[PDB]
Amino acid sequence: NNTATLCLGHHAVANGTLVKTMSDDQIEVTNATELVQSISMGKICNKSYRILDGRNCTLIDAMLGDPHCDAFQYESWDLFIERSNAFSNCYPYDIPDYASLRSIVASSGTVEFTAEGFTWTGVTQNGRSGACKRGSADSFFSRLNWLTKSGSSYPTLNVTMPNNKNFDKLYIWGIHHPSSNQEQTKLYIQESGRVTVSTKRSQQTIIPNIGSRPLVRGQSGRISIYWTIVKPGDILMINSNGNLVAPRGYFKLNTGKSSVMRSDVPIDICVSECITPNGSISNDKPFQNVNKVTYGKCPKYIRQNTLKLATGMRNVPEK
Amino acid sequence: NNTATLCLGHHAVANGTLVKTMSDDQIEVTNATELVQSISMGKICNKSYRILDGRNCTLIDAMLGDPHCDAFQYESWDLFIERSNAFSNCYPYDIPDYASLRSIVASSGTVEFTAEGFTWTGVTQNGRSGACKRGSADSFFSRLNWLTKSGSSYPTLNVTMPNNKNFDKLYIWGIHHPSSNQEQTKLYIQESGRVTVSTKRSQQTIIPNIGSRPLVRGQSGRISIYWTIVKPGDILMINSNGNLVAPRGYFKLNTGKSSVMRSDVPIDICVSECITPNGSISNDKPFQNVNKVTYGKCPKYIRQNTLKLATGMRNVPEK
Amino acid sequence: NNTATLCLGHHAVANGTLVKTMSDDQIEVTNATELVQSISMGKICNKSYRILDGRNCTLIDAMLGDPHCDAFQYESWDLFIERSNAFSNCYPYDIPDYASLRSIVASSGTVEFTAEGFTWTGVTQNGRSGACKRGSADSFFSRLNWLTKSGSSYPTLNVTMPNNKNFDKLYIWGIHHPSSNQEQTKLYIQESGRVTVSTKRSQQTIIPNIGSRPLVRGQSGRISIYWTIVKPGDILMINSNGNLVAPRGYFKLNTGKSSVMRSDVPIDICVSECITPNGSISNDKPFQNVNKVTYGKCPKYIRQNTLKLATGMRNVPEK
Amino acid sequence: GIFGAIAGFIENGWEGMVDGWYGFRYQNSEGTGQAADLKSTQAAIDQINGKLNRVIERTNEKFHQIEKEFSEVEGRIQDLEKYVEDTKIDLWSYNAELLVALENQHTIDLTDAEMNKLFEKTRRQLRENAEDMGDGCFKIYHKCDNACIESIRTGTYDHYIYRDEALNNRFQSGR
Amino acid sequence: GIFGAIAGFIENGWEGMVDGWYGFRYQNSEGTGQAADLKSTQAAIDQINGKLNRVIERTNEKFHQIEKEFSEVEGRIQDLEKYVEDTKIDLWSYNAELLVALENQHTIDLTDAEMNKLFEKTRRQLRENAEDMGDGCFKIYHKCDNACIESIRTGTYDHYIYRDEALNNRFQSGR
Amino acid sequence: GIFGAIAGFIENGWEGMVDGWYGFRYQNSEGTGQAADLKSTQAAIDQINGKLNRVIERTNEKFHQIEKEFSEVEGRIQDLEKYVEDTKIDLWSYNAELLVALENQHTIDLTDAEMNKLFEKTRRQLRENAEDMGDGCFKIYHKCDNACIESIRTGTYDHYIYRDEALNNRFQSGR
Ligand SMILES: *[C@@H]1O[C@H](CO)[C@@H](O[C@@H]2O[C@H](CO)[C@@H](O[C@@H]3O[C@H](CO[C@H]4O[C@H](CO)[C@@H](O)[C@H](O)[C@@H]4O)[C@@H](O)[C@H](O[C@H]4O[C@H](CO)[C@@H](O)[C@H](O)[C@@H]4O)[C@@H]3O)[C@H](O)[C@H]2NC(C)=O)[C@H](O)[C@H]1NC(C)=O
Ligand SMILES: *[C@@H]1O[C@H](CO)[C@@H](O[C@@H]2O[C@H](CO)[C@@H](O[C@@H]3O[C@H](CO[C@H]4O[C@H](CO)[C@@H](O)[C@H](O)[C@@H]4O)[C@@H](O)[C@H](O[C@H]4O[C@H](CO)[C@@H](O)[C@H](O)[C@@H]4O)[C@@H]3O)[C@H](O)[C@H]2NC(C)=O)[C@H](O)[C@H]1NC(C)=O
Ligand SMILES: *[C@@H]1O[C@H](CO)[C@@H](O[C@@H]2O[C@H](CO)[C@@H](O[C@@H]3O[C@H](CO[C@H]4O[C@H](CO)[C@@H](O)[C@H](O)[C@@H]4O)[C@@H](O)[C@H](O[C@H]4O[C@H](CO)[C@@H](O)[C@H](O)[C@@H]4O)[C@@H]3O)[C@H](O)[C@H]2NC(C)=O)[C@H](O)[C@H]1NC(C)=O
Ligand SMILES: CC(=O)N[C@@H]1[C@@H](O[C@H]2O[C@@H](C)[C@@H](O)[C@@H](O)[C@@H]2O)[C@H](O[C@@H]2O[C@H](CO)[C@H](O)[C@H](O[C@]3(C(=O)O)C[C@H](O)[C@@H](NC(C)=O)[C@H]([C@H](O)[C@H](O)CO)O3)[C@H]2O)[C@@H](CO)O[C@H]1O
Ligand SMILES: CC(=O)N[C@@H]1[C@@H](O[C@H]2O[C@@H](C)[C@@H](O)[C@@H](O)[C@@H]2O)[C@H](O[C@@H]2O[C@H](CO)[C@H](O)[C@H](O[C@]3(C(=O)O)C[C@H](O)[C@@H](NC(C)=O)[C@H]([C@H](O)[C@H](O)CO)O3)[C@H]2O)[C@@H](CO)O[C@H]1O
Ligand SMILES: CC(=O)N[C@@H]1[C@@H](O[C@H]2O[C@@H](C)[C@@H](O)[C@@H](O)[C@@H]2O)[C@H](O[C@@H]2O[C@H](CO)[C@H](O)[C@H](O[C@]3(C(=O)O)C[C@H](O)[C@@H](NC(C)=O)[C@H]([C@H](O)[C@H](O)CO)O3)[C@H]2O)[C@@H](CO)O[C@H]1O
Ligand SMILES: *[C@@H]1O[C@H](CO)[C@@H](O[C@@H]2O[C@H](CO)[C@@H](O[C@@H]3O[C@H](CO)[C@@H](O)[C@H](O)[C@@H]3O)[C@H](O)[C@H]2NC(C)=O)[C@H](O)[C@H]1NC(C)=O
Ligand SMILES: *[C@@H]1O[C@H](CO)[C@@H](O[C@@H]2O[C@H](CO)[C@@H](O[C@@H]3O[C@H](CO)[C@@H](O)[C@H](O)[C@@H]3O)[C@H](O)[C@H]2NC(C)=O)[C@H](O)[C@H]1NC(C)=O
Ligand SMILES: *[C@@H]1O[C@H](CO)[C@@H](O[C@@H]2O[C@H](CO)[C@@H](O[C@@H]3O[C@H](CO)[C@@H](O)[C@H](O)[C@@H]3O)[C@H](O)[C@H]2NC(C)=O)[C@H](O)[C@H]1NC(C)=O
Ligand SMILES: *[C@@H]1O[C@H](CO)[C@@H](O[C@@H]2O[C@H](CO)[C@@H](O)[C@H](O)[C@H]2NC(C)=O)[C@H](O)[C@H]1NC(C)=O
Ligand SMILES: *[C@@H]1O[C@H](CO)[C@@H](O[C@@H]2O[C@H](CO)[C@@H](O)[C@H](O)[C@H]2NC(C)=O)[C@H](O)[C@H]1NC(C)=O
Ligand SMILES: *[C@@H]1O[C@H](CO)[C@@H](O)[C@H](O)[C@H]1NC(C)=O
Ligand SMILES: *[C@@H]1O[C@H](CO)[C@@H](O)[C@H](O)[C@H]1NC(C)=O
Ligand SMILES: *[C@@H]1O[C@H](CO)[C@@H](O)[C@H](O)[C@H]1NC(C)=O
């Protein structure tokens, strides 16, 4: 005609997708994005964090110095992976407050050891055991020194070691529980032993406990493991008349981004910034449904496996 | 006239009600709904969960086997109610880390006991006490065996019991603290006793502690109670030269929806899906102000006693 | 002309300010308000809460009765400030579960002591030490009584003290660890001592532990501190054949608004209702970035140092 | 309301409408009548129904937990248990307060929208054949019986039919 | 703004209005003048005042808590204490960020609404006696002195009075 | 939508617009054509892009924490560790659900706004020279070639130029 008509509109697409609003359970829009990461990578990426595969070793074992853990001797990590085939292979023990020690060491992020010159006067050092074979010879945890009677004497040990460095030292020590009074007196003159590890500000006395326990690698005796933090300027002191499993030096204690994770998933050559037991996961979404156990730069864990965020107007197809 | 007038409107009601928006503190709408449950039912509904009324008994007592708790012997529950008249009536005791044991047993949801054939060679079993009357005769906790000297001997007990089932066993045992060296030697030859309960992976030695405590039901002695979890394939081992209060078997440990609640409110014949100390409460609202202690399918507990959700347009009455 | 034109508008200002919306990262409005308190006052206001400056004393020390803490003897507080120059000056000790005792006393909000008439028959009382000088004479913690051998005897102490008041009593006691068997027998006849503090419902036996520790103010011995809550109607009982550091009475235990805070910032004459280690802070904003450690009526702590709330329309300047 | 319809240009509500949420009243050659508009009423109701179920998860089973009441004074651990719970309660309490304000605000606004949406729909149908009276009323410049009114309500109204007539009644004026 | 009034069809703000938030400027037979519209200004301000107090509880007393700084390395328990606090802070931090965005968005939108609401109110008063110029201005087709303008502002304006005259000035045209 | 434009007065979307989000189709003396309107498209997109980054903090490094899986049955402490985590997860889960609903609602509404804003902009340009057809179409009462249409799109359209002509074609009528 000799007059015009002008119409306004908006676009639509062929492949619309449903989202949820305050007003509707499901409503179609032109485009939506997933906000929840639910696919893992199936493997832990060796980059960008420093990953140490524990293999057959637990973290506690690698630091104590179980013979099959000797390879970890010099190691530090961002994240230490604890596998499930993981087992122990040295003298049987137990750590009262195990998890705490596990946590302290994990966040320290190293099993690196600095030997110190302790003097144990009039006692035989380096007690070894058939339960703890290095190669195929009797041995013991490498970071512990098993002291017994020399000749016919075990005199009151009274050894001292001041902290002159400007950091906290972590000392790991222990006590040995023999299986019979017969064994006790044999290895440690006195009928009843004890250990009093002390500083200027704390102290801990541990008494051994005679008796048979179930056989573990041929042995019915046991060892209990304890720790002590010595502050700069402070001073360590070990007093014992029997049963002491002595430290060989200290662990440097670090404040750091370090940790430990239980995982059976393999380690592979890729890059990523977030790790779960299920593997490394992608970083870009705000939420995540893979695992509540996470390390690194991770999206927040939530219960839902899917959440759609509208990134376009409402989709109204021809009709 | 010969022309029309057409008006648009919306409805109003006589009984409007005030709500809160982002823009107004109070504003009248056509209808509102309460979002907070603040009325309880005054009673605990015997359905739908399985409720066990502890009556005079605590949960710990029912499992240990206090004589007035004998009725609970065979019981399992979804929720065990602990009343306040609740009291003890057997030998005086204490459980170091009581709450933990209470929690472990509560979530297990049973006090059902499987007896095992333990052998205590050369000691008299079934030690009873005037403080723990079954009917009107001296007795003791039914799940514990109080061992004393036989003749003139209490030899080192060395008893074993492997876990061959495919679940964790829970073993409850104890030690007896006598009131005088006079009493100690009388019931247990040796001047100083001990108990070393052990598995392949853990161990606990407890030494008795001589001395007078305040009289409870005529007795000044005491008992301390301990537990031990034995894993499948693992093995229990009890080593004692005096003072051992022996287990009679195991408790099967369950993963379950079970729990315990402190309440004085009566139990009645009704139906509901959420329980608080104040009684069962209704399920349908999202929030709840009755009690922060809840069990079951419950609305979330909040501080406010009222919250109104508008379910109609703004109400504008004639004017 | 002979016809009019009427225009509608809104105001603008010269000094607009940027805010964040759902739709824009930065957008200018006519006025905005800060929602996060990030400036502290630099000092703790002596009003409105009751503040006690610990000065050279820790909270634990003031209650135990360290001689340089004698001034706190009669004190109660809303908030007790623990400084960092703070040091100890009495006999060397340690409290197993220190933090808990610190917390219990802090929330009680008093170190006020009620002496009781305990009878320690056939032992010398008031044992003093060169490490704990009152004025310039040997002394000891004022709330503890150090008992030793009288003549050639230390008989089994068996002292009792019922709670006849209608509140819980808190009793603080301890045990002494000597440095050598030589010292032990000298001060406490028996070779091995013990303490069994008990009520009708709980009990705790502590054995001393012989041995040398590092010198603190000339002394190598130590003291370990324990507590006991005695309920109304219940009864305290102390049984000891050596090494007991006896209580002199009780602390009244309060439910209250009281607490303790580590701060080095000075106390000054002002008014405020919220306190942080950095000083008192202002109350009026909803959020706060000064410190996560707060006491009183405080805004919630968040990570961001700034948050702007629009309090005017969008600002559109001439153009 | 953001749209100025409800409690604004529309003076007030009709208690006489026991019939629907939105509608019409009309005066014509056959008298005066009233009819509720269902689509509008439905659009609102649909948005308001199940409103809360689009944010709050259908309430969830929860069994054994932590203890939240205590007989003994313990310190450190009990301190933590009390704080964990206290934190949880305070955070949910915020959530609930904010949720109510958000939803109510939304509700108010969507109902004002539906009113406006319907007025606008009607205005657009009528074209220059009518007049916005300002109180949500249209002066219609032609004889409009019940079948005529009913057609505006169904959305079948044809203004080209009435254009000529409307113009006459409209442009009678001028001095 | 959702309404396209502020920073849209209304070109910009008036710094000259030290008087109110919304208003009029007019040119007539008596000259040019300016008047702030109080009801609009009040409606906005009322919504913006005490805004935050409709979501955030009046700040609450809190006394003894958990410890949040540590001298010693302890492990398990300290691990938990640090995580409880860290969780609490991160969750409140979210709350505060979202709250600000929500409120500001709402504020922006309600102020744009009030502007539009007022323009619309005025347009409706005038009827076919006027012309929407497009920049939030009305061409009024008749002699309109200050008493005339003032009446539009009070909401007392009567267009039936000016209809005839308006029509004349309007329909002078056609070629 | 609150504005009734998208999925309301505008019947439906144009799949043929591979060009922009909002625009025009026109029929004139030169034939029929289609042009996307960039400012509208841009205003929407700008609001939708980086939407979530205005609420959610750029994701943060987190290292050693608490344990969340357990081999042994321990009671009290493990009870607390499990509850702390469970609480954390449930609270974030709420946050995420509410956030999505809020954002989507906002998105829907701002896109409906931009459509309406553009229709309104165009209507205001045309004045009495045109007619609101009701389906988001304008009947233009004068010969309007592509340069004419293009001018309406640029915002340079002058109605005083076409007034006389429009009136003629408009007021041809009356019987
Ligand atoms: C308290 O009570 C406990 C349990 O009754 C005692 O502990 C047991 O002590 C006996 C020895 O006195 C142990 O017997 C030994 O068992 C070893 C382990 O066997 C396991 O593994 C092998 C595979 O290599 C399997 O056969 C089997 O599945 C077992 O699980 C054996 O290797 C030893 O074998 C040697 O002895 C035999 C028989 O005399 C010889 O012919 C062989 O050549 C070989 O040299 C041995 O038989 C028993 O295992 C211990 N049990 C536990 C649970 O520890 C304590 O001794 C007791 N304490 C006291 C009395 O103070
Ligand atoms: C360490 O020190 C404590 C406290 O001094 C001693 O423990 C007390 O020991 C005496 C006995 O030596 C106890 O006396 C007995 O008390 C019983 C409980 O009485 C309570 O209940 C009754 C109601 O039945 C009430 O009368 C009263 O309110 C009490 O609370 C009595 O039942 C006993 O009565 C018998 O003795 C009397 C008097 O000789 C006879 O005439 C009667 O016939 C009857 O048979 C008895 O008197 C006292 O209760 C203990 N106190 C506590 C707190 O335990 C330890 O003995 C001591 N340790 C040592 C020395 O090693
Ligand atoms: C187990 O092993 C430990 C460590 O080897 C022993 O503990 C040490 O015991 C000796 C004494 O046997 C202590 O020696 C004494 O040290 C005191 C502290 O000195 C500190 O402070 C002063 C400032 O006043 C500084 O000089 C210095 O920096 C020190 O840090 C001295 O004050 C004593 O001085 C007295 O003795 C000297 C020398 O004989 C006299 O000439 C003086 O006049 C004065 O009276 C004294 O020398 C030593 O400090 C202890 N060390 C620790 C770490 O405790 C245990 O004895 C041992 N246990 C056994 C054997 O059972
Ligand atoms: C059938 C028989 O009696 N054989 C003798 C054998 O008996 C024991 O075999 C061992 C493997 C155990 O299972 C035990 O239960 C059997 O009865 C003797 O073997 C030694 O037995 C002693 C004490 O009974 C120890 O068990 C010892 O173990 C070592 C070890 O760790 O391997 C030797 C270490 O050098 C020693 N380390 C020290 C002193 O530092 C330790 C340590 O003393 C204990 O572990 C502490 O708990 O013990 C077995 O080698 C042998 C030798 O006497 O004779 C067989 O005829
Ligand atoms: C006035 C007087 O001396 N009477 C004698 C009485 O003294 C005690 O009375 C009892 C009720 C206590 O309050 C006690 O403090 C009084 O001195 C004697 O009663 C026994 O006393 C002994 C030791 O002093 C025990 O208290 C014993 O208790 C039993 C019990 O539990 O009831 C008997 C049990 O069979 C026994 N169980 C065993 C061995 O397995 C226990 C157990 O030995 C202890 O509880 C362990 O701590 O003790 C009282 O019956 C009687 C009998 O000797 O003589 C009165 O003249
Ligand atoms: C060089 C030398 O041997 N000097 C003798 C001195 O030896 C000790 O000096 C003191 C300061 C210590 O550092 C010690 O290690 C030195 O060897 C003697 O000093 C006493 O030594 C004894 C035991 O060795 C105690 O250390 C005692 O300390 C007191 C104290 O606390 O000050 C005296 C108190 O009155 C006493 N309190 C009581 C009994 O209630 C305490 C208490 O017995 C212990 O602290 C418990 O652990 O000890 C020193 O005064 C003196 C005196 O014998 O002779 C010097 O020649
Ligand atoms: C509708 O939205 C979806 C998802 O929101 C669009 O896909 C996504 O688009 C983003 C933004 O450009 C992509 O980011 C890009 O990633 C690549 C490689 O990683 C990079 O080279 C670019 O510079 C940019 O950062 C993102 O990859 C992609 N999302 C997914 C899950 O694949 C989609 O294209 C949009 N659809 C339409 C029709 O507009
Ligand atoms: C305005 O809203 C209120 C509350 O939102 C209305 O009362 C409620 O209406 C609901 C929805 O129908 C009722 O649910 C019903 O419950 C019964 C029995 O439990 C069941 O048989 C039905 O099938 C349905 O599920 C609910 O009971 C009721 N709420 C309360 C607290 O009683 C009210 O009727 C509405 N008012 C108006 C004027 O519309
Ligand atoms: C724009 O808003 C800002 C901040 O929102 C305005 O400053 C603030 O105004 C409030 C409300 O009146 C002030 O409260 C007053 O405090 C004084 C003394 O404390 C008291 O005497 C009054 O009765 C009233 O409660 C508040 O002090 C003030 N905020 C700050 C941080 O100083 C500002 O004036 C507004 N600007 C414009 C141009 O409207
Ligand atoms: C709870 O305990 C009390 C006993 O202490 C029981 O009630 C008593 O019944 C006995 C007779 O059997 C009498 O001594 C009294 O008449 C009752 N005492 C009181 C205080 O009322 C009650 O039966 C016990 N409940 C159960 C389930 O055993
Ligand atoms: C806190 O402790 C120090 C003592 O260690 C006190 O300040 C000292 O005062 C004494 C004299 O009384 C002198 O040794 C020094 O002049 C001061 N020492 C220092 C390091 O400045 C101080 O008085 C104590 N505070 C209280 C409240 O007792
Ligand atoms: C991740 O591993 C857990 C066990 O740690 C397992 O239960 C779960 O199925 C895995 N999740 C995914 C998403 O693969
Ligand atoms: C529920 O019981 C508690 C004690 O557990 C009591 O303080 C409270 O008043 C009760 N609440 C209601 C709503 O009845
Ligand atoms: C407050 O004190 C802490 C140490 O407790 C310090 O790290 C921080 O810088 C201070 N904060 C402010 C805002 O001054």
Side-chain angles (χ1 to χ4, degrees), chain B residues 33-72:
Chain B
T33 207
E34 237 304 331
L35 255 38
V36 194
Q37 187 69 41
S38 53
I39 278 165
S40 137
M41 293 184 204
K43 60 201 189 286
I44 300 170
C45 295
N46 65 328
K47 300 305 176 175
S48 59
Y49 297 108
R50 298 188 57 231
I51 319 288
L52 186 61
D53 190 346
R55 304 183 185 274
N56 287 332
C57 289
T58 75
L59 174 66
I60 284 296
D61 278 332
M63 77 105 152
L64 289 174
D66 197 314
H68 77 311
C69 299
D70 269 6
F72 302 98

Side-chain angles (χ1 to χ4, degrees), chain A residues 13-43:
Chain A
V13 293
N15 76 325
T17 171
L18 297 193
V19 298
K20 190 194 65 174
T21 67
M22 295 206 96
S23 290
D24 289 279
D25 297 320
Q26 299 284 78
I27 187 154
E28 205 187 328
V29 285
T30 57
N31 203 15
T33 207
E34 237 304 331
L35 255 38
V36 194
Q37 187 69 41
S38 53
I39 278 165
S40 137
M41 293 184 204
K43 60 201 189 286

Side-chain angles (χ1 to χ4, degrees), chain D residues 100-142 144-155:
Chain D
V100 154
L102 251 21
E103 294 292 10
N104 292 353
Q105 188 53 53
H106 175 258
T107 298
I108 252 75
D109 284 334
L110 87 263
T111 43
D112 201 36
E114 285 296 336
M115 185 68 265
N116 205 236
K117 266 141 69 89
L118 177 63
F119 173 92
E120 230 52 41
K121 191 199 172 291
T122 296
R123 193 216 56 198
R124 280 204 184 83
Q125 270 204 98
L126 266 24
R127 312 264 280 256
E128 19 66 302
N129 284 7
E131 195 86 53
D132 192 321
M133 297 191 91
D135 33 86
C137 291
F138 297 108
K139 182 101 165 294
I140 295 164
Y141 281 109
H142 63 81
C144 192
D145 57 302
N146 291 338
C148 175
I149 291 294
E150 202 258 23
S151 82
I152 303 175
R153 294 191 273 118
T154 345

Side-chain angles (χ1 to χ4, degrees), chain C residues 13 15 30-34 284-285 311:
Chain C
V13 293
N15 76 325
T30 57
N31 203 15
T33 207
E34 237 304 331
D284 65 286
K285 301 177 176 57
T311 47

